[PDB]
Every structure is written in structure tokens, then in C-alpha cells.
Amino acid sequence: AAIDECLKNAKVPVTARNSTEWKTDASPFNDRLPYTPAAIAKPATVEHIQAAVLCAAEVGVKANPKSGGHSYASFGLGGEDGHLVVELDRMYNVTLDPETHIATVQPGARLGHIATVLYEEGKRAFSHGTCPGVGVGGHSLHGGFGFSSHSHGLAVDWITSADVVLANGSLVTASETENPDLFWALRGAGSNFGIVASFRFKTFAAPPNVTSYEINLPWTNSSNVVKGWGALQEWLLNGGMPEEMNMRVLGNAFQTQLQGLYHGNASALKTAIQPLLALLDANLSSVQEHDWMEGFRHYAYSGEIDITDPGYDQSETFYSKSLVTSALPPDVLERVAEYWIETANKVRRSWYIIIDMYGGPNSAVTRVPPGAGSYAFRDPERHLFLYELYDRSFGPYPDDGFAFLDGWVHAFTGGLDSSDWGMYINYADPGLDRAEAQEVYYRQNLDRLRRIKQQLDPTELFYYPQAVEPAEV
Ligand SMILES: *Cc1cc2c(nc3c(=O)[nH]c(=O)nc-3n2C[C@H](O)[C@H](O)[C@H](O)COP(=O)(O)OP(=O)(O)OC[C@H]2O[C@@H](n3cnc4c(N)ncnc43)[C@H](O)[C@@H]2O)c(*)c1C
Ligand SMILES: *[C@@H]1O[C@H](CO)[C@@H](O[C@@H]2O[C@H](CO)[C@@H](O)[C@H](O)[C@H]2NC(C)=O)[C@H](O)[C@H]1NC(C)=O
Ligand SMILES: *[C@@H]1O[C@H](CO)[C@@H](O[C@@H]2O[C@H](CO)[C@@H](O)[C@H](O)[C@H]2NC(C)=O)[C@H](O)[C@H]1NC(C)=O
Ligand SMILES: *[C@@H]1O[C@H](CO)[C@@H](O)[C@H](O)[C@H]1NC(C)=O
Ligand SMILES: *[C@@H]1O[C@H](CO)[C@@H](O)[C@H](O)[C@H]1NC(C)=O
Ligand SMILES: *[C@@H]1O[C@H](CO)[C@@H](O)[C@H](O)[C@H]1NC(C)=O
């Protein structure tokens, strides 16, 4: 078709429709949502990215970058059939300056590879998610929370500059001192404004030791959930969690536990965690000291860490939702707990809920001031918890299944003003219509995002079904 001929004339490498590699390059992370691209560009340099974008614009098709392909909604494929997919995973080089400790990271680099290179070359790191196969592109442009985030912030907070290919093929560099409006927009909503062709990240010196631990929670009835969660949020909100401590609740039908990573040794951990244990009347278990990379591996749930193979094909079948909330009033705790015990525990699929200890007085995430970037959730009191709700099937996903997580989220949002909750596009939820998605993902920053979208991509070349809409001018 026209897009294929345009790419050929422009000397852009592609994955041909009738090739083995099409299957891999086109594949979703979420097997519930396959889409068939119009074509797949396979750039090895920024020039190819420019040429691919220009071809999309000239021919009249939509285009989307795909970095790691982990979008829960397959938005790296366009979120619908018939987009040019700019597959970035042949571009995964990571370079670390020995002097400034700034890393230059190609946009197809996955987190495991990044972590490995930074650590092996200079004992450096930046703050990012668990899951070594996750692409740096989608992850860092919309937040990126992990087991260093209470200590060191979101992946987006370590971005120091970026080179971007705009919808008309122009090149720009964005930083605090250059195209600062674009730099603001990128840092929370980056999928909407261009294709990032190179990232520069600051780093911190990796701690020599980290200690993983677990605290099993007796959340077997609604009363225990309410009381335990009520104590836990009160503790976090009141400054109970030290900067070195990074933690979450993981819940499923069969166990609930706190899981943490303490940036320090086991004895430091025991001392630091004692007050919470006394508050919750629980005990520590599975206390394990690690070197930095062993710490990453512990929560990676992956044999492969340093992943660079374009054959990468990890996938699951699922529905997922997210939330960001303040502390919850007890009546909301009660409804959420009732749903957990009476509904979630009886759902005959592999579901889980993660509640990250996200905000509060000591969190590096919510220390970032409210004007620093488009990412919306920076208030230390109002943005206390981050949630991932995940509903996985091993056969095909049942078409009536969505009511489960939808109902659970309603138990939260019913009792919270819209100013006290939002949602997180790194757990992209295609159940949300376009208007609602923009509002819940970006909240108070939507209006400015829409203005910058009109300035930078007025034709919506980078469209997907939950993309920011250009402001009307
Ligand atoms: C599958 C998976 C996802 C995880 C995992 N662990 C996470 C964690 O511990 N913390 C988190 O905060 N998030 C975790 N996630 C979710 C991922 O963070 C999100 O799914 C990311 O958005 C995925 O990034 P990526 O793998 O790059 O996904 P794509 O589908 O390729 O892109 C998503 C989105 O971003 C746009 N985009 C990609 N690349 C670019 C560039 N270079 N420039 C602009 N825009 C870009 C895409 O077009 C798309 O819209 C653990 C697991 C197992
Ligand atoms: C990533 O970095 C490697 C260097 O480590 C680049 O590899 C070189 O590629 C050129 C031409 O493609 C070869 O002539 C060299 O021999 C390669 N060097 C080595 C040491 O292998 C590679 O080009 C870079 N990849 C990207 C996408 O930019
Ligand atoms: C490519 O896109 C950019 C932004 O969409 C255009 O640059 C802008 O041009 C306007 C007026 O022409 C200026 O007022 C802005 O300040 C520019 N923005 C930036 C970021 O440079 C650029 O003109 C476009 N190029 C073409 C050929 O259309
Ligand atoms: C502590 O870290 C060092 C590397 O910094 C590592 O060699 C050692 O094994 C770690 N100790 C423990 C108990 O994990
Ligand atoms: C919840 O379980 C605890 C024991 O784990 C019990 O003491 C408590 O009474 C239970 N509450 C209700 C309402 O069943
Ligand atoms: C644990 O860390 C503390 C620093 O907080 C240090 O004083 C102590 O030496 C460490 N313990 C061991 C066994 O290294």
C-alpha cells in the first residue's frame, strides 16, 4: 500500500507483512487485544524515525512508537488496527558517562537491560519499575513506579533531556532550559507529543545492599481489612515510612501481605519497621539482604534480566484497572473491604490488587513540586496510594469479566470527590472512553496538555483511543 511504498522510497527498514518477524513485532503484551498494523517501521536511527513519521503524515495514516510493547491496552500498536507502528526495539543502546553519571538511553531499551548496564559499568541506577521487559519509552514518559520510588521518585523524574521527532518530522531537544513546555508535556503524557528518539537520564549511586521483606496480613474478613488498612494509611500519612523504605500491599484470593525493599541492611530494616509491626501486631518474614541487582531480580519475576532480544514475546491475557487515591474514609474502606471479601475472593480467575505506599511526608514521588511536569499525582496528602488491579485468565478472557474490576473501582470512587482520585496510564484501561480517560489520567494538567497538543500535533498523527485531544483554537 501507499505507506509501504513511502517507507521503501525513504529507505526506512521495515518488517514485511509476509515475514516471520511480523508476528513478533506486531504482538501485544495483552493477548486480549491484538491489533494489525498498517505497516511496521524498524528504525535503527533517528533519521529513520523522522522518515517514518513523515511517511505517515504524507500518506495519511496514524503512527505510534512501540518501545517495550507493555501497554495494557496495546496502545504501542495504535489501540486499533491500521496504524504505522514505529517499532523501536532495535534501538536499545545504553551509554553511561563516567564523569557526570548521565546515561544516554535509546528509546527501545528495556528496564532490565538499562539496570544491568548502569550497574555493571558504574554502580549507578535510576528509579524505575519492576519487570525487566518493560520498555523505557512508555514507562518513563507516563511515570514509572517501583521499589526505589519512595526513596528516589518515578522513572520520569530521572529524565534530564530528550530528543524528539515531531509529527511534521522536525527534531527538537527538550529539557528544563529548552522547549520547556514540551519537556513538561513529555514528563507524564509523552505518548501524545512526538516520538522520543533518545533519552538522557540522571542516575544515583546504587546502594551496596538492599533488604527485601514481607509482612503477612490477616485480611481474611472485612473487619480486619478495614482496621489494618485504616492503621496503615494513618501510619503512612503521618510520616511513619522512612525514606529508605519502599513497600506495597499485594493481595489475592489466597494471601495478603506487605512486600518491601529497604535500601539498607537487615538490622537497619528490623529497627525501621518495628513501629509498624507493633501498630499492626504482625511479624516480619522472608528477610533477605541482597546486592543491588539481586534486589532487582528478587521482584522481577523473570529468569531473563538483561533483555535485548527482538524475539521478546512475553504475554498474558487480562483486564486491568488502576487508581490513585488519598487516604480513604472508613465508609469507603468498608465498601472496598466488603467487595474484596464477598466478591473478589469468589472470582474464579487469577486476580490481584497492589496498593503501593506511594505518598506521605517522606515520599520522593510527592516531593516533586506540582508544576514540574504533566504527570498529575504529586501531592503528598492527596496522592497517598497507587493501585494496580489485575484480572488474568489462562483461557480467553470472559466478556462479562469487566464488571469485577469495574465494580471494585466503583467501591472506591463512589465515596471520593473527583479531586481525590485519578488513574494511571501506565496501567492503561481501555474500558474508559476517550473523554473520561484524559480526565482521570491527567486531571488538573489536561487543559495545558490539550493546548500543547494543538501546538505540536494538531492533526493528531500520534492518535490512539485515549490520546489527548487538541484544544479548540
Ligand atoms: C507488561 C508489564 C508492565 C509493567 C510492569 N511493571 C511495572 C512497574 O513495576 N511499575 C510501573 O509503573 N509500571 C509497570 N508496568 C507498566 C508499564 O510501565 C507500562 O505498560 C508502560 O507504558 C509500558 O511501556 P512500553 O513497554 O514502552 O510500552 P509500549 O506499549 O511500547 O508503549 C506504551 C505507550 O507509550 C508510547 N511510547 C513508547 N515509546 C515511546 C517513545 N519513544 N516516544 C513517545 N511515546 C512512546 C506508546 O506509543 C504507547 O502509547 C511489568 C510488566 C510485566
Ligand atoms: C549500538 O552500539 C553498537 C556498539 O556497541 C553499535 O555496533 C556497531 O555497529 C556498526 C555498524 O552497524 C559496526 O560496524 C560495528 O562493528 C559495531 N560495533 C560493535 C562493537 O559491535 C550499534 O550500531 C549500535 N546500535 C544502534 C541501534 O545504534
Ligand atoms: C513543525 O512543527 C513545529 C511545531 O508544531 C513548528 O514550529 C513552530 O512554528 C511556529 C510558527 O511557525 C512557532 O511560533 C513555534 O514556536 C514553533 N515551535 C517549535 C517547537 O519550534 C514548525 O514550524 C513545523 N514545521 C513545518 C514545516 O510545518
Ligand atoms: C552486600 O553488597 C555487596 C555488593 O555491594 C555484595 O557483594 C554482598 O553479597 C551483599 N551482602 C549481602 C548479605 O547480600
Ligand atoms: C474477623 O476475624 C477475626 C480473627 O481473624 C475475628 O476475631 C473477628 O471477630 C472477625 N470479625 C468478624 C466480623 O467476623
Ligand atoms: C547495617 O547498617 C548500618 C548503617 O545504617 C551500619 O551501622 C551497620 O554496620 C550495618 N550492619 C552490618 C552487619 O554491616
UniProtKB/Swiss-Prot annotation:
The Gene Ontology CC terms held by the record are:
extracellular region
How is temperature linked to this protein's activity? Optimum temperature is 30 degrees Celsius. Stable up to 60 degrees Celsius.
Entry's localization field: Secreted
User: What EC number(s) is this enzyme filed under?
Assistant: 1.1.3.-
InterPro entries assigned: BBE, FAD-bd_PCMH, FAD-bd_PCMH-like_sf, FAD-bd_PCMH_sub2, FAD-linked_Oxidoreductase, Oxid_FAD_bind_N
UniProt PTM: The FAD cofactor is bound via a bicovalent 6-S-cysteinyl, 8alpha-N1-histidyl FAD linkage.
Q: Where is this cross-link: 6-(S-cysteinyl)-8alpha-(pros-histidyl)-FAD (His-Cys)?
A: H70-C131
Q: Which annotated residues bind substrate? A: T130, R248, E388, Y427
Q: Keywords assigned by UniProt?
A: Disulfide bond, FAD, Flavoprotein, Glycoprotein, Nucleotide-binding, Oxidoreductase, Secreted, Signal
Q: List, alphabetically, the SUPFAM superfamilies matched.
A: FAD-binding/transporter-associated domain-like (SSF56176)
Cofactor comment text: Binds 1 FAD per subunit in a bicovalent manner.
Q: Which GO terms fall under molecular function for this chain's record?
A: FAD binding; oxidoreductase activity
The glycosylation sites annotated in the UniProt record are N18, N93, N168, N209, N221, N265, N283
Q: Where is the FAD-binding PCMH-type domain?
A: 33-206
Q: Which cofactor does it need?
A: FAD
Disulfide pairings: C6-C55
Keyword presence, Disulfide bond: yes
pH dependence per the entry: Optimum pH is 7.
Asked if the record carries the keyword Signal, the reply is: yes
Q: Which reaction does it catalyse?
A: D-xylobiose + O2 = D-xylobiono-1,5-lactone + H2O2; D-xylotriose + O2 = D-xylotriono-1,5-lactone + H2O2; D-xylotetraose + O2 = D-xylotetraono-1,5-lactone + H2O2
**Family recorded in the similarity comment:** Belongs to the oxygen-dependent FAD-linked oxidoreductase family.
Provide the function of this protein: Catalyzes the selective oxidation of C1 hydroxyl moieties on mono-, oligo- and polysaccharides with concomitant reduction of molecular oxygen to hydrogen peroxide. This results in the formation of the corresponding lactones, which typically undergo spontaneous hydrolysis. Xylooligosaccharide oxidase is able to oxidize a variety of substrates including D-xylose, D-cellobiose, lactose and arabinose. The enzyme acts primarily on xylooligosaccharides, indicating that it prefers pentose-based oligosaccharides over hexose-based oligosaccharides.
- The name this protein carries in UniProt is Xylooligosaccharide oxidase
Organism in which the protein naturally occurs: Thermothelomyces thermophilus (strain ATCC 42464 / BCRC 31852 / DSM 1799)
